[PDB]
Design a protein around this ligand. Sequence first.
Ligand SMILES: [Cl-]
Ligand SMILES: [Cl-]
Lengths: 22, 28, 41, 127, 320, 159, 187
Amino acid sequence: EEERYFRARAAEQLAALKKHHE
Amino acid sequence: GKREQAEEERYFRARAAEQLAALKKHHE
Amino acid sequence: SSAGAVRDAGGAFGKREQAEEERYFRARAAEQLAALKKHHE
Amino acid sequence: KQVAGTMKLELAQYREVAAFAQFGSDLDAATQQLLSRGVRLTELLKQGQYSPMAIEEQVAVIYAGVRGYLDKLEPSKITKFENAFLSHVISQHQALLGKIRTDGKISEESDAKLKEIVTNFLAGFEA
Amino acid sequence: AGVGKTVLIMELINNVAKAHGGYSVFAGVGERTREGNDLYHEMIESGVINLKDATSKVALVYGQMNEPPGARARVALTGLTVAEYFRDQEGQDVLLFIDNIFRFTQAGSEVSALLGRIPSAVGYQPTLATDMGTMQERITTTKKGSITSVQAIYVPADDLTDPAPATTFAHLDATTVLSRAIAELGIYPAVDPLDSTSRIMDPNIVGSEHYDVARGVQKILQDYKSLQDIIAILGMDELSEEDKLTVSRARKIQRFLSQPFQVAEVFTGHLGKLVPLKETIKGFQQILAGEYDHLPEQAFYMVGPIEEAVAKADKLAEEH
Amino acid sequence: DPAPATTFAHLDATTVLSRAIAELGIYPAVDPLDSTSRIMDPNIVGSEHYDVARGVQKILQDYKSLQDIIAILGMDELSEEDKLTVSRARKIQRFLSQPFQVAEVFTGHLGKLVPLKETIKGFQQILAGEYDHLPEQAFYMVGPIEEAVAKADKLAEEH
Amino acid sequence: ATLKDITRRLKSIKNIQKITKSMKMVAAAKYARAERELKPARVYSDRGLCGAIHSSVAKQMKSVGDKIRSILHRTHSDQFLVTFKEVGRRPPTFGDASVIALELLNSGYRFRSVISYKTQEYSLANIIYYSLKESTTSEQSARMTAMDNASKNASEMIDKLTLTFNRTRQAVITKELIEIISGAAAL
Ligand SMILES: [Cl-]
Ligand SMILES: [Cl-]
């Protein structure tokens, strides 16, 4: 796995900011 | 090795407790 | 560094590995010699 | 550069795994791909003495291995495949080999053209 | 090679010239002449050397493999003397470079051999310590100015106990380990945060806030490399909330260590940044406390101060 | 060492002897992964000579890699493919040995002299897998491949 | 003692280090298979190098798996019957577990964590399947940690032998140089 977990976590945090600035 | 001692001393420190546990019971 | 370095050293693992092979093929020699009894007879 | 860049990377993935293949047995299909390409790309690195190849010919034998045409074929037949494949392209397809030497690069047309030559030759290799 | 060695050298020349207002000196001691040609034109591309007008920041002094032991032995002294001018006369904070320092030790051994002297241990000169000592002690801070030297070391046979590096190690105040493994991850500059150390890393010297924040980053990176071994052998299920929090923060930290340089503006895009000392400490301290956990990992990759990491996260959020 | 090392350049064919091979009992103790010759070429000696000779050197080199695995595991934990590679390798080691006519008093047995193609065809059968059923002791100190099969008849009847 | 002996010894352990590193990941791969299959199985060996599991099983018996017989043969041979082998490479299944049940009636007659472990026809087939699934998961976790220790203990020996190598390396250069200087002096 190594980076698969935190790559998925990083993608979710982008979506949080996108929804926040609306 | 340094950890050669780590494995060996861990084995006999456990066996020291087991042998002392057998010795204390016979002492009673 | 290179292959076959264990037996080249000739220590505990080197000599025990040489003995370990000798144990295996001595037992297999008896099994294979027993097969020659059946094919001959 | 186009073929050897991907080739060097896949060999740079193989050698790390290498030791696991000796007693792997039950193993996932993802890392199994590295064993497959790894051993087969190593067979391409073999070469007979006094037998130098042209730059346009060398890219063709790596193009086959790198794009995954050797994978379905057995490791024992890789040396046999290269000798057969190299003779096929040199004899009948001089137009393609000459174009690679002139351009110094596998162009958009030459990639699709070379793809056609390997796929057809791979189909019906043995007799 | 393959770590951005010459890029680091050109940047340090640029930054020390821009911030402290002091020129630099590069001493090509006993390396390849080809490498001199490579560096010479790279410096013109970046702009640290300028042929058109007198605005150059570097003075080159080359004496390479092709020249005899006597020539190679005293190139370091020739370059040092140029650096000594800017310290002693113009009162500058000077930046010397010696690549490679092992060649000074080698050439010194070769001259001592040819002169006819009973050699020391491992075939080195009897005057190993004195030849190094008379050179290194000239590189110091005076009341007029200073000469800060960055000396490239080739450790022979990977043996730190060898006389050549060991004698050199006494004079060193710091190190800068450039790893290829770090460079493969995309983290430029490719400085290993663990293996790189300094003598001045002490609460008395750098300060209370500097030492604790610096040791805080060194702790979490050591904990990251420990916990990453568990991910490989076992899996992600083994790591708890305490463990998985520090791993996510460590990935942001190691990406924040990266920086776009002014030297690599002709190489690639991204404007070059010069980060102050206070901005650096303030940046990494806030990550360890856990202020920028909500922000993603990509925003920390390649930025100057901590402010740009916040601005890039909003800009990257507009995409998706 | 300088004295033997410098001599290698002056030679066409070499025969590098080994103590480790000698101490096992293999005589002549010739190193199969060291002794080389300039004439060893498929064009010179023929492709059948070259392929079989290199084939012997391939399995004996791979045998050294397996020996490192056997030191920790043992012969039992190895796969079916790896067990057979060792079996064929150990039989090849012993078939390379040969009793000399000059060394009758040392060995005890009478000396031999094997022809060319008897040597080529002998090791070719062992690599192909035609003597898996026979034990490794039969190949120790014999002339041609026929004597190995003939010795296996005596070892069977004695056993 | 001598530069040549250190080199052969250093190369020997370097190989043993890499081979033990390989057996750690292979044991870790088999452990991942063992934990998934044990999750539903709780609700319902021959290969050594796995801590002290074979002796731990022998502890409770005196007071399946061919290696268990090796310990018990010379002590008490005639008591327990049956015996099986080839249990270690491939984990147990319904096909292989059912043969154990057949040699009982139709005849003449535990995993805690990664670093610690504790020791009519259809109903008997359930309990035997539970034990072997617990046994197979325990040995792979132990072989992982045992081989992990074997590589780490080898790494310590490599580190210290590298120092003794480099000390002896320098001394051989120094000593042999002094021979030549002494030789030139006497001319
Ligand atoms: Cl020059
Ligand atoms: Cl002036």
